[PDB]
Design a protein around this ligand. Structure first.
Ligand code: 3ZQ
Lengths: 149, 144
């Protein structure tokens, strides 16, 4: 499958280091973003602590590493993440933030959508203890013609 | 507004530690004014605003218009910021905003993650990410 390059939005920061990972935890998060296109829940779960959580905010949360892996495995049964572009990354107080676009493709329909997402990651000892992504679900569902909620 | 299960127990996570973060938290406090003319004073001439499920506004005049339009329909009754952080001139806030639709009188606690770009203590960009359909269904108002 061919995926077109994600363009830079108008509001992308004039600060050239805004998209640069400047700490070990930020670097882990950008590596994790790169790994998303693997569509491989077993690969991704290795980034997570045992005590952890994951939530796409328009949907119910998953608590615990097993449940997070199961949620991811379920997601990748239906969707492919074809590309991730992280415009901005920052962090304070043990939380890392990423402003991104993820290209999501619904396997049942063949249709894709570039999702605008702002995500937050909590890390302890270099492991993810929480990951929440904020975006509008209805836009995605309408674009890929697949109800998710 | 309840503390989410995933919210940091360390109160420092929600406290401003930089001048830009302090400004953003002052701005969050000011939102309950529901007053676009007051709020626009926080913005640079070169700026933008977008609730991500809706169209963006570019330039200070357009941002003021969009804010004014918003406050004709909604009141912001409270803003609670659980987490705040920043790097490279961008501030991030994980919050719950309590919004009330004036036409229906119904309220909803919206989970929002927002980003603010600042230059010289003024806002050059503000984007809030959340699910709009949830708000619409809770306050009985077809916003989009
Ligand atoms: O940001 C999320 C939005 C929903 C599908 C996966 C994407 O990465």
């Amino acid at each position: 499958h061919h995926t077109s390059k994600i363009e830079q939005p108008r509001w992308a920061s004039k600060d050239s280091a805004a998209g640069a990972a400047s700490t070990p935890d930020e670097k882990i998060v950008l590596e994790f973003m790169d790994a998303l296109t693997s569509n491989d829940a077993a690969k991704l779960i290795e980034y997570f602590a045992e005590d952890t959580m994951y939530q796409n905010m328009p949907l119910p949360p998953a608590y615990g590493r097993d449940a997070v892996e199961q949620t991811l495995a379920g997601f990748f049964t239906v969707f492919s993440i074809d590309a991730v572009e992280t415009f901005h990354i920052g962090s304070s107080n043990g939380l890392v933030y990423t402003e991104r676009v993820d290209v999501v493709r619904a396997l049942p329909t063949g249709k894709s959508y570039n999702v605008s997402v702002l995500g937050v990651f909590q890390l302890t000892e270099g492991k993810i203890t929480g990951w929440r992504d904020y975006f509008d679900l209805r836009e995605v569902e309408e674009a890929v013609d697949l109800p998710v909620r």
